[PDB]
Every structure is written in structure tokens, then in C-alpha cells.
Design a protein around this ligand. Structure first.
Ligand SMILES: Cc1ccc(N2C[C@H]3C[C@@H](C2)N3)cc1C(=O)NC1(c2ccc3c4c(cccc24)C(=O)N3C)CC1
Ligand SMILES: [Zn+2]
Ligand SMILES: [Zn+2]
Length: 307
């Protein structure tokens, strides 16, 4: 029968577009391989008249596409693009309410960890290295966060509907950020000093209190570890969830966690004119706070001990 054609664009990064002429009598998969339209898998579908001029994602199947994908995402995992598209097909349907100019996410698909991470990322100073994260983060800050959320799911190898860990999520994203100038000097009292750089310089697991880290924490005979010097724009202090008192103006933000390991619920606590509890789309305020906290973030620039 008749052979009709339309013009479309293919891409791996939505920056470099490659004009294609498509045969409407064949499926996209027969012509391109796995093919996606705004996240939806159209590999098994034939071109529709309405697809003319639209942009489709394809898997990198030639060296030009391979280079474009790597330069944009900073990954060689061949499953990455398909996982990113599968997540986007869901996150494009989430809602992203603004809370005091912070983009949150209405609860869906056990995404409380992602809303809490997204809110945190808008409150600390971070520069991503992969252009894909740079571009999507800028959009997310302005309220259009579906692509950023799908990329986070793909980078962290999380499926939509799976509850993830905020500390683990932030840690992996930090591996894609420019933290090269961050430095931490510790003394453990023999008396021994160590210097950490990069992501290890901004994370700690064992106490929520930055002040306690400065004064000294006991670690295994028992010794005292304390912070000698900190050069970073923030620090993330974490510990297994425990009841904790947060005081206005003494922290930047924090992760509240209720429930059991791997199956509970996160909320986000931030300090503004009072304490805000952002719970996806829901906001409550209170002058005081006591509750189960598992991460606290503190802004920083340069700290030097007086010990
Ligand atoms: C919410 C979530 C999602 C995923 C995961 N996972 C852990 C390992 C496996 C893969 C994914 N990776 C953990 C949590 C979780 O529940 N994470 C916290 C937690 C709760 C209760 C805890 C702990 C402890 C140590 C560290 C974290 C933690 C602990 O000792 N208890 C009793 C932050 C909430
Ligand atoms: Zn949840
Ligand atoms: Zn000792």
C-alpha cells in the first residue's frame, strides 16, 4: 500500500536534534530501535500525523549519539536513558506545588524522599557537573521539576513507587557535583589528624548535631573525634532516626522520618521566620519542634576550631 512519510527529530539529550524522515508504514522501533515521546515508549507504535515535527528520544546506537549521551549525562550505563524515560513518564504527571518559593512534590508513588531531597537541594549551594542535571535543576528551582525528578530516579537506580533514602540519594547526587574545594580536618585523640576532601568532607553519619561534632564525639578503648577545620558551603549530619529538638535559626533544614526502616515517611523541616514542616503539598508552622530526625543540613563557609 501507500508509503507515507513525516519529518521528526531524534535526540539523546534534547539539545542536539537530528532530522529524520520516517516511513509511516513501519513502527518507530523498526526504524530507530527503542524510541520515546516525552517519556512514553513508542517503539511498537506507527507514526501518527500529529507526530510531525516532534522530538523523540532514541538509544545511542552510533558513535555520534554515544558521545552526545555521555557528554550530557556523564554515564555509560546503556540502561540509563530507558530508565530515565520510564521515570519521566510518571514524574511528568506529578504535581509540584510551590511552598514559599520552594518547589515541593505532591505525594505520589512513595516519593516523600524525593520531595524532601528536592526541597533540600533548593536550600544548599551545589553545582552539578553533568549538563543534564545542571539544566534540569535550574528548571526544577523555577517550578518545573519533572525532568529533575526523573533524572534523580535514573541516576540512583530507583523505580517509581520505591521508597528511597534521602541521605543515600543526596550522597549519590553529590558524586555528580563539583565539591573539589570542600575540605574537612579531623583530630582523633595518641592524637591523630586526617584531612578529607570532596563528598567525604561534607557528610557525616553518627550525630545530627554540628555543635557536638565541633565539641567532640566518642568513637571506638574510646577516643574523641572532633572537627578541626571545615571549608564547604554546607554540611550534612546524619544518624539513625531519633527524637530531636530543632531550634529556629540554628540549622538550615532537616529530614524527619517516621516509621520503620525502608517503609516509612519523610517530611522536610526548614527554618525561616519560624519552623516550617513541609509534607509534600502540606505546610504547617510551629515555633518549636521535637520529632524523629535523621538528617540535618547546616550552611557553612569556613570554620576553624578554638580547641
Ligand atoms: C527510607 C529508606 C529507603 C531505602 C533504604 N535502603 C537502605 C539500604 C538498602 C538500600 C535502600 N540501601 C533505607 C531507608 C531508611 O529507612 N533509612 C533511614 C533509616 C531508618 C531506620 C534506621 C536506619 C538505620 C541506619 C541508617 C538509616 C536508617 C538504623 O539503624 N535504623 C533503625 C533514614 C531513614
Ligand atoms: Zn513516602
Ligand atoms: Zn585509642
Amino acid at each position: 500500500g501507500e508509503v507515507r512519510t513525516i519529518k521528526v527529530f531524534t535526540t539523546v539529550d534534547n539539545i542536539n536534534l537530528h532530522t529524520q524522515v520516517v516511513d509511516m508504514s513501519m513502527t518507530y522501533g523498526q526504524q530507530f530501535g527503542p524510541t520515546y515521546l516525552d517519556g512514553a515508549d513508542v517503539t511498537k507504535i506507527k507514526p501518527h500525523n500529529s507526530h510531525e515535527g516532534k522530538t523523540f528520544y532514541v538509544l545511542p546506537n552510533d558513535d555520534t549519539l554515544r558521545v552526545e549521551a555521555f557528554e550530557y549525562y556523564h554515564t555509560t550505563d546503556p540502561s540509563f536513558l530507558g530508565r530515565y524515560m520510564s521515570a519521566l513518564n510518571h514524574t511528568k504527571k506529578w504535581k509540584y506545588p510551590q511552598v514559599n518559593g520552594l518547589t515541593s512534590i505532591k505525594w505520589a508513588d512513595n516519593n516523600s524522599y524525593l520531595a524532601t531531597a528536592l526541597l533540600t537541594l533548593q536550600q544548599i549551594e551545589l553545582k552539578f557537573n553533568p549538563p543534564a542535571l545542571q539544566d534540569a535543576y535550574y528548571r526544577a528551582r523555577a517550578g518545573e521539576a519533572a525532568n529533575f525528578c526523573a533524572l534523580i530516579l535514573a541516576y540512583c537506580n530507583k523505580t517509581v513507587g520505591e521508597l528511597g533514602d534521602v541521605r543515600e540519594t543526596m550522597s549519590y547526587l553529590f558524586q555528580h557535583a563539583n565539591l573539589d574545594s570542600c575540605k574537612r580536618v579531623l583530630n582523633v585523640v595518641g592524637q591523630q589528624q586526617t584531612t578529607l576532601k570532596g563528598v567525604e568532607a561534607v557528610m557525616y553519619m553518627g550525630t545530627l548535631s554540628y555543635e557536638q561534632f565541633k565539641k567532640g564525639v566518642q568513637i571506638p578503648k574510646q577516643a574523641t573525634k572532633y572537627l578541626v577545620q571545615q571549608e564547604s558551603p554546607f554540611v550534612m549530619m546524619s544518624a539513625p532516626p531519633a527524637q530531636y529538638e530543632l531550634k529556629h535559626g540554628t540549622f538550615t533544614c532537616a529530614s524527619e522520618y517516621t516509621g520503620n526502616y525502608q517503609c516509612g515517611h519523610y517530611k522536610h523541616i526548614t527554618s525561616k521566620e519560624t519552623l516550617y514542616c513541609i509534607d509534600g503539598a502540606l505546610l504547617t508552622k510551629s515555633s518549636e519542634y521535637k520529632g524523629p530526625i535523621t538528617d540535618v543540613f547546616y550552611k557553612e563557609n569556613s570554620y576553624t576550631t578554638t580547641i
